[PDB]
């Protein structure tokens, strides 16, 4: 037969925009519940594959799906023997998840009498994964990258640029983030030097200027400055 | 038969990441060319539907595809007469674009003898559209929203928030953009008042303070201050 | 039969020069796409084996190819039974990647009716790997090796020479890099000592001169110098 | 038969615009590869013939194509002579490039069973040529035409006007280039005289004024001025 | 039959790494002799085609191979008459070089009774070529580009950038090379001006500042300054 509730182009685009705009806020759960209703496991897998970024969250979702597939296998004992020509094989957990089943098999299960709604079962598994992501997963934010009090400026710059590469933004916005947040979120010891350097300093100049922060000479210099302020 | 070069989960995710990270920089043309080789028009349509945002760009792409389909229809004249039972209908432009053709028909055209590579024809049409986008389309940027010299502060705030809603960023990043760019990119007449308000000013207080800029009272007051400087 | 699109000597040399000149900049993706079109998986493997250096990137590419081969195996079920004498075995994921297939088998698949373009499928897998490399892989640079603020000079020298051995350069250029960058990219505490040492100092004398930096005596001496400057 | 992927008017116009806008930046390689897919060698030659200017680059491309045709002829031995009435002659290197083959022969090769993708082979040869151009060819720029320290002003003017005639620009832009760059890019010895002449000076007047630069009289005069400054 | 000593992926990669790391130092001769032993002329040609850069060296090697092939043809007289059906044609010099012989013919010669080791003969020819390269070929070096005493700065800059384009380095290393060596290896007359310009000067500003060096004005000015020092 045919699946009447196969996802339309606008449904897929709406799901993509939901993920891009809201990330994994709780709002994602109702949206996925409504956009994916009636769809085959193949359509749900398409929707899950359209998620860009958030690799850790997607791995969490995959783990949850695998656990639910194991639970399905536990509850449904394997039947051994020759299947009737009219009948078809009973779904397994991987069949529900669509890893070991074709679209035709999923449609056959969904449109059979009695019907096995593999799409809805898989949808509930995905919802469990999404709930776990919403509770547990925290996406990386370039706004959260601050230099530690004893962190070398080079390591902080490396973390900043890694997070910026993972950041969802336009290249112009990422350039503006580099120009604004990197110096601002440095620790006070490095920030003093960076401000003394001037606004026109390049990254190499900034990195050389802070290369000694925490070394013997810089420690002695700041200690002597504080002691001189005290004596005066 | 079956299509061996149907897009895999990783192929679709790579396309999604390419669009999210590069927007419509020229790099999008090779990637789409390489990620979509040998795919059916249905897979191409899926890839196009996973593009979030850039609605004007997608409208441009659709116009280009429609014009290419019209060109195909002009080149291939429709032949009147019943098709042979072992033969299938010759594709029209809409058939290549995937609008009026099913996946089975596309596979039949691609795997026939002689083959009609509808996927590759549609790929070239999409590449023409993408080239037009890369040449002529410029995405909206929150960094580009600046108050006009005579523009009311309300209108500028409205434009800023519309562009922010359209911006591809996390909610925390969007909040930071609101806290940073809105006052910064205001015109000097509003910006002096906004600075006089102080950092703690809310949006409504900021908008009330600038409500009279350009009115008779504000014009008279600034002229009076300037002539106070002059006749000092 | 024969493969009409086997890579020519100039095609292979062009690929080698692309890798040597641009490393894994995005330009590598279109170039590989155009140089390898119509080639057997054996030719693509020949092209991949000519990449000198970038071992981590090539391991990434191999992981991507293995994932795509697993996806192929998942989508193509194994058929058990006696193959027809006029027929050949259906390609598996390793067969497309060329690990478990011979050049004759690849040519037979590519030139059969219906054809299985194993070269094109493998090319898309390699393109996915190259896209991952372009996005995620960053080659080591001798210019990026700087001494940490608390790093011993000997450890920094070891890191510098390891990176220099990995660097793509002529031996004369590498000697010039040793003569220019090693002292330049040392931290301020070691740089002071190295500059006081003189331009004729050897590597052993430089390591001896900086051997005590961060030790108790050096710390006391720099502290005393700072305090003396403060008292005076 | 007929070629389904024959270049459309928009495809050819896009190729022309790509060449006009980007000259031979790396971007030309993907665009060509995308615009020329599935086309006959005749369409490829039409695409190549629309390149205006860059004659040296076109010559390099022709040399690369001839080299690839020679390689093809080396790999494919010439048949004995008994051509089957139902079969057609096997293509040579010149047939792949379309110099000695007609459109009908190219279509026959492309649509035959087994197929010989003469268009794609030729496209690979053209891509090799374009890669050579991108790597090696540098277009002449009016911005780079500067007078040598001992170059006569007449010779520099002649070089400037030759380059300007070769430059891609409108006549008004060329006139503005003449009014701006010619005096600006002269050597200091001629530039001083040109500045002393005044903005209204014509080309003939400037050329007459600089006719003596480097001669014994001008050298003696400039030396005398320098010595007079020294004595005073 | 089959060639048991066909080059493995690691053999080819080792040869590529040898050429990239050692260029044509004498170490290349043993390495090539060891990696290539027992291989067909086709494998030898692959290894030679994987050499990027050093085009003059490769031309020398090709000339040496052609002369050795001529020597082989002189020593082995061509015999007129039909070859025996069980026998194969006797190799010519081009057959040993692999230009006019297919892989099947090479394998047939190497595995015949008595055997003709065309691979070993070709290897000795290549060794002669590599020896000629090691003795007579010196690769271009960016470190060797120095401005002549009265070379115009523009010509020296052109030479520097051509050599830099030919240089085997990463783009970052080439940028650093431009930042360091170009001013450093200018002649003293231009170098004084370049230092007077300052570190922030662009290439166009440097070319304008040195455009007059060697012209009448600059010669008179420097002579006048020297005479000022003398008559001081
Ligand atoms: C052809 C088509 C119709 C299809 C299909 C199709 C079929 C099956 C599956 C699949 C479903 C369920 C399980 Cl439980 C496993 C499994 N279990 S296992 C042995 O432990 O790994 N494997 N698969 C791969 C299988 F089946 F192919 F083997 C699956 C997918 C998933 C959909 C999915 C994506 C996701 F993110 C998280 C999920 F929970 C499920 N997509 C992938 O898995 C590929 N992926 N994975 C991960 C990650 F690791 F981060 F989670 C990532 C991807 C990514 F999308 F690239 C993206 C960056 C993130 N799609 S179409 C048009 O969409 O291409
Ligand atoms: C079921 C499935 C396999 C399928 C399919 C499927 C089938 C056909 C088409 C389609 C293709 C070509 C043309 Cl030429 C037309 C057409 N020509 S017409 C009379 O002028 O409108 N109509 N269609 C709708 C048709 F065919 F249904 F009639 C099409 C699509 C397109 C793919 C596409 C997306 C795109 F962005 C630009 C394109 F050029 C083509 N997607 C849509 O069209 C929906 N869309 N449109 C637009 C816009 F208008 F902005 F461009 C937008 C969307 C959006 F994705 F929401 C996104 C915000 C942007 N997908 S699946 C798993 O992928 O869901
Ligand atoms: C004879 C010939 C025609 C052939 C062939 C030939 C045949 C197969 C393969 C191969 C292809 C695909 C997979 Cl998926 C695996 C696999 N999968 S596995 C079980 O997990 O390891 N193994 N192979 C080895 C196999 F098949 F032989 F078993 C492969 C290769 C690869 C080509 C390749 C190179 C590459 F860099 C990255 C790739 F993704 C694929 N070359 C190698 O792999 C050897 N290599 N590997 C790595 C690394 F580890 F860094 F990635 C490195 C090399 C290196 F080249 F030395 C270089 C330093 C880097 N070539 S010829 C003229 O070319 O000599
Ligand atoms: C009927 C029709 C459909 C056709 C065809 C048609 C057929 C063949 C060829 C051709 C193709 C390949 C080779 Cl390898 C040779 C060859 N090899 S050879 C013995 O060394 O000269 N000769 N030809 C002439 C041949 F075959 F006709 F004899 C060719 C062309 C080329 C296409 C081409 C253009 C190009 F720029 C660079 C190329 F590599 C290939 N166009 C020309 O060559 C004319 N050209 N050449 C050069 C230059 F020298 F600068 F590169 C220039 C032109 C120019 F366009 F004027 C432009 C200023 C530059 N077109 S159409 C479109 O006319 O209506
Ligand atoms: C298909 C395959 C199995 C094969 C083969 C294959 C077959 C033959 C040959 C060949 C061998 C010997 C001679 Cl004596 C001649 C010849 N004699 S002649 C009439 O005077 O020119 N011609 N050939 C071309 C022939 F045979 F096609 F006619 C050859 C090559 C050579 C191998 C080679 C490379 C080399 F550097 C120096 C050599 F001495 C020999 N590679 C080329 O020639 C292409 N090349 N040439 C030169 C240069 F000119 F600089 F030396 C350059 C290249 C380059 F690689 F691009 C690189 C920049 C340098 N490869 S595979 C997988 O490897 O692609
Ligand atoms: C009589 C005078 C008024 C004064 C009073 C005394 C005097 C003084 O102290 O001023 C002693 C120094 C001299 C003699 C001047 C006169 C001028 C000359 C002269 C400027 C002459 C032109 C010559 O130039 C050339 O030959 C051109 C050149 C490029 C070198 C070439 O052709 O190769 C040079 C060599 C540059 C000299 C330098 C010596 C002095 C200053 C004298
Ligand atoms: O007590 P110490 O044995 O002398 O330890 C010191 C000291 O650590 P203490 O807090 O225990 O005193 C310093 O201070 P902390 O950072 O750990 O708070 C620390 O680092 P800093 O000097 O940068 O502050 C480092 O001192 P050093 O920089 O010399 O490594 C360390 O080791 P030392 O014994 O070598 O001084
Ligand atoms: O000074 P240059 O820029 O190099 O050019 C030359 C050159 O001088 P050099 O010795 O430095 O090369 C000539 O040679 P000399 O006599 O000084 O040895 C000299 O005179 P001659 O040409 O007669 O030999 C004179 O050349 P000119 O007669 O043109 O003045 C001079 O100046 P120019 O740069 O103007 O040629």
Describe the protein's architecture and organization.
Chains A, B, C, D, E: The modification Phosphoserine is found at residue 8. This is part of a larger assembly, with five copies of chain A (232 residues). With 232 residues, the first copy, chain A, is mostly helical. Chain A contains twelve helices and no strands. One Lenacapavir binds at residues 42, 45-46, 48-49, 51, 55, 58-59, 61-62, 65-66, 97-99 of chain D.
Summary keywords:
part of a larger assembly, 5 chains, 232 residues, mainly alpha, 63% helix, 0% strand, elongated, binds Lenacapavir, binds ligand 2I4, binds inositol hexakisphosphate, Capsid protein p24 (chains A, B, C, D, E), virus like particle, HIV-1
Rg of chain A, please? Answer: 27 Å
Bound molecules: Lenacapavir, ligand 2I4, inositol hexakisphosphate
> What distance lies between the first and last C-alpha atoms of chain A, to the nearest angstrom?
91 Å
> What's the quaternary structure here?
part of a larger assembly
Overall body shape of chain A:
elongated
By DSSP, the count of extended strands of chain A is 0
Largest sheet descriptor of chain A: none
Helix content of chain A: 55-70%
Q: Classify the secondary structure makeup of chain A into a structural class.
A: mainly alpha
Modified residues (Phosphoserine) (chains A, B, C, D, E): 8
Organism (chains A, B, C, D, E): Human immunodeficiency virus type 1 group M subtype B (isolate HXB2) (HIV-1)
Region (Dimerization/Multimerization of capsid protein p24) (chains A, B, C, D, E): 137-223
Protein name (chains A, B, C, D, E): Capsid protein p24
């Amino acid at each position: 037969q045919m699946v009447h509730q196969a996802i339309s182009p606008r449904t897929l685009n709406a799901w993509v925009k939901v993920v891009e705009e809201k990330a994994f806020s709780p709002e994602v759960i109702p949206m996925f519940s409504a956009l994916s209703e009636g769809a085959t496991p193949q359509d749900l897998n398409t929707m899950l594959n359209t998620v860009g970024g958030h690799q850790a969250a997607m791995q969490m979702l995959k783990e949850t799906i695998n656990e639910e597939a194991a639970e399905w296998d536990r509850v449904h004992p394997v039947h051994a023997g020759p299947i009737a020509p009219g009948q078809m094989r009973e779904p397994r957990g991987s069949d529900i998840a669509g890893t070991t089943s074709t679209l035709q098999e999923q449609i056959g299960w969904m449109t059979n009498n009695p019907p096995i709604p593999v799409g809805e079962i898989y949808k509930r598994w995905i919802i469990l994964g999404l709930n776990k992501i919403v509770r547990m997963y925290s996406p990386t934010s370039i706004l959260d990258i601050r230099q530690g009090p004893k962190e070398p400026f080079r390591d902080y710059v490396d973390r900043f640029y890694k997070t910026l590469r993972a950041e969802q933004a336009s290249q112009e916005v990422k350039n503006w983030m580099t120009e604004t947040l990197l110096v601002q979120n440095a620790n006070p010891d490095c920030k003093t030097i960076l401000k003394a350097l001037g606004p026109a300093a390049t990254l190499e100049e900034m990195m050389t200027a802070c290369q000694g922060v925490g070394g013997p000479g810089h420690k002695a210099r700041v200690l002597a400055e504080a002691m001189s302020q005290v004596i005066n």
